[PDB]
């Protein structure tokens, strides 16, 4: 199970790139979010993550989908 601290940190990093504050970011910024968390995903790993969280193909990731993906990863 994710801890409160992890959820908070996932949220904070995500929100750094949510410039309009509506809880969504671009798939192009997912790598930046991950590196903001101190991680270093490969291009392949990011593509697999993008396939998971951008379920509908529109290039937009919302926080709830990001978080559950992060939970699976951990």
Ligand X SMILES: C[As](C)(=O)[O-]
At closest approach, how far in Å is the CB of 54 from Na ion?
A: 14
Query: Is 62 a known ligand-binding residue?
Result: no
Question: Shortest distance, CB of residue 61 to ligand X, whole angstroms?
Answer: 8
56 binds, among Mg ion, ligand X, its own copies, none (CB under 5 to 8 A by kind): Mg ion
24: β partners: 62
60 Cβ contact partners less than 8 Å away, ≥ 6 residues apart:
24, 25, 26, 27, 54
Instruction: State the binding partner of 65 from ligand X, Zn ion, Na ion, none, CB within 5 to 8 A by kind.
Output: Zn ion
């Amino acid at each position: 199970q994710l801890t409160e601290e992890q959820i908070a940190e996932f949220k904070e990093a995500f929100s750094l790139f949510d410039k309009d504050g509506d809880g969504t970011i671009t798939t192009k910024e997912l790598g930046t979010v991950m590196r903001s968390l101190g991680q270093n995903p490969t291009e392949a790993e990011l593509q697999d993550m993008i396939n998971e969280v951008d379920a509908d193909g529109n290039g937009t990731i919302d926080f709830p989908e990001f978080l559950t993906m992060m939970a699976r990863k951990m």
